Amino acid sequence: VNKTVRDLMPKTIMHLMINNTKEFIFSELLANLYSCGDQNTLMEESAE
Amino acid sequence: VDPQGQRTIGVITKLDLMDEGTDARDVLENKLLPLRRGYIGVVNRSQK
């Protein structure tokens, strides 16, 4: 049981979290990034 | 301690005690020392 939990617990987290937040970064980040905030008073130049 | 000014808020007190002919417009419009979060002007109770 220890072997079959060690061989399987990385897979479940990395199918539900890694390869899903990565897909979200590919295909949805801009869509909601446009929506959050003003979309106009965003990406304002830092004083530097 | 906070170079980018992301967790810093500036407050200007004693706005009623400024010299005759002077005003804090240049600093309250966040132009004199541009800070990201802006400057809030308050007027507390005098010692009297």
Side-chain angles (χ1 to χ4, degrees), chain A residues 8-22:
Chain A
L8 190 61
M9 183 278 288
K11 302 178 184 295
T12 175
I13 55 178
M14 282 205 307
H15 181 74
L16 292 149
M17 179 165 288
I18 301 299
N19 293 22
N20 188 212
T21 193
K22 183 173 71 66

Side-chain angles (χ1 to χ4, degrees), chain B:
Chain B
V1 303
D2 174 18
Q4 61 257 7
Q6 214 73 12
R7 58 166 158 109
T8 304
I9 310 169
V11 65
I12 302 309
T13 62
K14 303 188 182 187
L15 289 170
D16 48 350
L17 283 187
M18 289 217 65
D19 190 7
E20 285 282 352
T22 317
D23 64 325
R25 185 190 207 90
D26 295 307
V27 61
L28 288 181
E29 298 174 350
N30 200 13
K31 299 196 314 298
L32 190 145
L33 181 47
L35 205 42
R36 184 187 179 282
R37 292 271 160 71
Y39 289 151
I40 297 97
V42 309
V43 183
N44 311 336
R45 282 162 296 163
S46 62
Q47 185 79 0
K48 165 172 297 306

